[PDB]
């Protein structure tokens, strides 16, 4: 009988199908992390800039 050989082939078939999807997911995940990293960099800078502006105006108001 060829039962074990056939199962090896069928298991490899399924492993190949999933593997294809894993590769696509890894690539997509990388691109998304790339995109979000630049977004996070900008968020950090903007947050800091706002914080400074707020402290400045708070100090100015204190004197009024």
């Amino acid at each position: 009988g060829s039962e074990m050989e056939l199962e090896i082939d069928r298991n490899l078939d399924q492993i190949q199908q999933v593997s294809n999807r894993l590769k696509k997911m890894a690539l997509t995940t990388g691109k998304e992390l790339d995109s979000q990293q630049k977004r996070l960099n900008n968020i950090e800078e903007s947050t800091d800039d706002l914080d400074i502006n707020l402290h400045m105006n708070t100090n100015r108001l204190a004197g009024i």
Binding site: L12, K23, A26, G30, L33, Q37, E44
Partner: protein, 61 residues
């Protein structure tokens, strides 16, 4: 034989991409910890500004 070798090659490539991704998510985590700290600062400063402005509003009144 060739199908299995091709599969191995694809899996090895995917491991490489995922190792890259792990390094990237660490960079993302570091950035998020920093932004959380700064967003906390921002909330505090915003509240402080609100209060200070209110105090001037009452003063001018």
């Amino acid at each position: 034989g060739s199908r299995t070798a091709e599969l191995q090659a694809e899996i090895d490539d995917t491991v490489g991409i995922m190792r890259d991704n792990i390094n990237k998510v660490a960079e993302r985590g570091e950035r998020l910890t920093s932004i959380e700290d700064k967003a906390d600062n921002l909330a505090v400063s915003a509240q402080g500004f609100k209060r200070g402005a209110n105090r001037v509003r009452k003063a001018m009144w």
